[PDB]
């Protein structure tokens, strides 16, 4: 259980994630006080306990993986076993004695595990949430922007620096490094900063989690067109995608994974072009992006940089 503890350690050590959930939940104290909550995928149980601190009478903490033992332990240890009930197994088959006033979950991320988690939360909403019940978070939004990855630039430049240190010219391996690091069709999860961002980020989709038939909409695919204009001269390496989610308040609380906001464990998802393309101030960058489900979540991208012809590059997540 090494990667098992590391995953839960990583989440809890993310103060942006954890304070956002804590405040997001607490700020609904008036709607939660004395009410019932389902925590879908409770993990170590911290979100369920946040709900109790907000005043919930009963929280059902449903967890499919072995970490539920630790959740049971943490709740019992905090003396909340009367108010938080840890239930092992998948949410799709759990039996609650009542329908709930609110659902909390932390389903977001990049890959098949997270897609499966949203589906499970939507299954639970339809099955167990009362009409007009609270969803925490309630919505998500997806953003895209052209980027220049400084770390990648260094790695691509590395082979040209070997001569200076060891008297052997390996500059000829730039082509090789580029093909290997950029020519694949995988999504790369990497943390960027604001200076990597080459234009204004564009929202390309919104997911309102209360909508019935969202499961159906997701299966078709989520996304849309985008357009933007670059800020200055740079080697454009591709696009970054990220999300935010919103907790209703009475101003809503936003948990964001943007490169301009504090770093989170989610980082951003990078879509590299096959090789770098030079952009300038006012270079138009436009395209269409679609995220959809051999069991793979495909990212379909068609884009145009400047006067270049439109190009397709499709990526995938097999997990
Ligand atoms: C079609 C679909 C279905 C479920 C679904 C996704 C996409 C998205 C998603 C992630 C976060 C959100 F706030 C919203 C959506 N997910 C992705 O992997 C993803 C996003 C960008 C790239 Br690149 O990949 C998995 C997920 O958490 N949920
Ligand atoms: N169908 C399902 N039913 C119940 N739990 C699930 C599930 N699919 C995944 N999970 C669990 O959901 C968790 C997501 S990790 C989030 C953990 C916790 N809510 C926290 O915020 O700290 C994992 O621990 C995983 O085992």
Contact of 8 with 44, CB cutoff 8 Å: yes
Angstrom distances, CA of residue 276 to CA of 138, 252, 288, 299, 302: 38, 39, 19, 20, 16
27 known ligand binder: no
Q: Ligand 1 pocket, 32 CB below 6 A?
A: no
Q: Are 262 and 122 in a shared domain? A: no
Token code pair at residue 282: 């006012």
| Residue closest to 144 by CA, chosen among 207, 202, 222, 206 | 202
Buried b / exposed e along 130-154 (16+ C-beta atoms within 10 A): eeebbbbbbbbbbbbbbbbbeebee
C-alpha span between 39 and 41 (Å, rounded):
6
Positive or negative: CA dihedral 196, 271, 259, 283: positive
Does residue 88 sit in the same domain as residue 151?
A: no
SS3 289: strand
Sorted by sequence, the CB contacts under 8 Å of residue 144 that are 6+ apart come out as 201, 202, 204, 226, 239, 240, 241, 289
Contact 91, 116 (CB under 8 A): no
Instruction: Using the structure block, give the residue that is written with the tokens 């967890």.
Output: 63
Q: CA triplet 27, 29, 30: central angle to 5 degrees?
A: 110
Resolution, angstroms, 1 dp: 2.0
CA distances to 3, 135, 236, 304 from 313, rounded to whole Å, are 32, 35, 15, 11
Residue 115 CA, ligand 1 centroid: distance in Å: 6
9 alpha carbon, distance to own chain's centre: 17
Domains identified in the chain, total number = 2
- Does 51 share its domain with 179? no
Asked if 54 and 47 touch (Cβ cutoff 8 Å), the reply is: no
The pocket around ligand 2, CB under 6 angstroms, is made up of 11, 40-44, 46-47, 62-65, 67, 90-92, 106, 117, 120
Q: Are residues 117 and 228 in the same domain?
A: no
For residue 114, give Cα distances in angstroms to 41, 105, 159: 11, 11, 37
Would you say 142 and 222 are in contact if contact means Cβ atoms under 8 Å apart? Answer: yes
- CB-count burial class (<10 Å; 0-12, 13-18, 19+) for 202: buried
Kindly state whether residues 149 and 100 are assigned to the same domain: no
Tell me if residue 115 is catalytic: yes
Residues 55, 22 share a domain: yes
Residues 85 and 187 in one domain: no
Method: X-ray
Task: Report yes or no: 183 and 161 within 8 Å, Cβ to Cβ.
Answer: no
Query: Is 8 labelled a binding residue?
Result: yes
**Crossing angle of the two packed helices 15-26 and 46-53, in degrees rounded to 10:** 30
Atom 3 in ligand 2: which residue has the minimum CA distance? 90
> Residue 41 annotated as binding?
yes
The CATH number covering residue 104 comes to: 3.40.50.150
Report CA-CA distances (Å) from 158 to 126, 164, 169, 309: 53, 11, 11, 30
List the domain range (segments joined by +) for residue 306.
Answer: 139-319
Q: Is the peptide bond before 137 cis (omega within 30 degrees of 0)?
A: yes
Q: Is 17 annotated as a binding residue?
A: yes
Verify whether ligand 1 is closer than 6 Å to residue 222 (CB atom). yes
Count CB atoms within 10 A of the CB of residue 2. 6
Residues 146 and 287 in one domain: yes
| CATH for 151 | 2.70.160.11
In this structure, how many other beta carbons lie within 10 angstroms of the beta carbon of residue 188? 19
Q: Is the shortest distance between the CB of 205 and ligand 1 below 6 Å?
A: no
Counting Cβ atoms within 10 Å, is residue 168 exposed (0-12), middle (13-18) or buried (19+)? exposed
Q: Which of 137, 163, 196 is the last residue of a domain?
A: 137
**Does the beta carbon of 218 lie inside 6 Å of ligand 1?**
yes
209 & 94 share domain:
no
Nearest CA to ligand 2 atom 17: 43
Reference 183, options 230, 238, 146, 242; nearest CA is: 238
What's the token pair of residue 190?
């990497």
Whose CA is closest to 126, among 35, 63, 42, 215? 215
Give the closest residue to 43 by CA, choosing from 26, 23, 24, 18. Answer: 18
Instruction: Assess whether 131 and 148 both reside in one domain.
Output: no
């Amino acid at each position: 259980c090494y990667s098992d503890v590391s995953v839960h350690e990583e989440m809890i050590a993310d103060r942006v994630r954890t304070d956002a959930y804590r405040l997001g939940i607490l700020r609904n104290w008036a709607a939660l006080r004395g009410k019932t909550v389902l925590d879908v995928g409770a993990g170590t149980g911290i979100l369920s306990i946040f709900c109790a601190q907000a005043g919930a009478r009963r929280v059902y903490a449903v967890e499919a993986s072995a970490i539920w033992q630790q959740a049971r332990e943490v709740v019992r240890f905090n003396g909340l076993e009367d108010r938080v009930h840890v239930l092992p197994g998948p949410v799709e088959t759990v039996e609650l004695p009542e329908q709930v006033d609110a659902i909390v979950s932390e389903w977001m991320g990049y890959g098949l595990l997270h897609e499966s988690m949203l589906s499970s939360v939507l299954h639970a909403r339809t099955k167990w949430l009362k009409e007009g019940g609270l969803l925490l978070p309630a919505s998500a939004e997806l953003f895209i922007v052209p980027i220049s990855d400084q770390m990648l630039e260094w790695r691509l430049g590395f082979w040209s620096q070997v001569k200076q240190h060891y008297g052997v010219d390996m500059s000829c391996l730039e082509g090789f490094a580029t093909r290997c690091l950029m020519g694949h069709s995988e999504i790369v999860v990497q943390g960027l900063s604001g200076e990597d961002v080459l234009a204004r980020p564009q929202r390309f989709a919104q997911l309102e989690l209360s909508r019935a038939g969202l499961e159906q909409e997701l299966e078709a695919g989520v996304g849309g067109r985008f357009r933007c204009s670059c800020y200055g001269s740079a080697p454009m390496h591709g696009f970054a995608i990220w999300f935010q989610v919103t907790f209703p308040g009475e101003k809503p609380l936003v948990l964001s994974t943007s490169p301009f906001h504090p770093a989170t464990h989610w980082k951003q998802a990078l879509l590299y072009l096959n090789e770098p393309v030079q952009v300038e101030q006012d270079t138009d960058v436009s395209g269409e992006i679609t995220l959809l489900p051999p069991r793979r979540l495909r990212v379909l991208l068609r884009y145009k940089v400047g006067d270049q012809e439109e190009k397709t590059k499709d990526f995938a997540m097999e997990d």
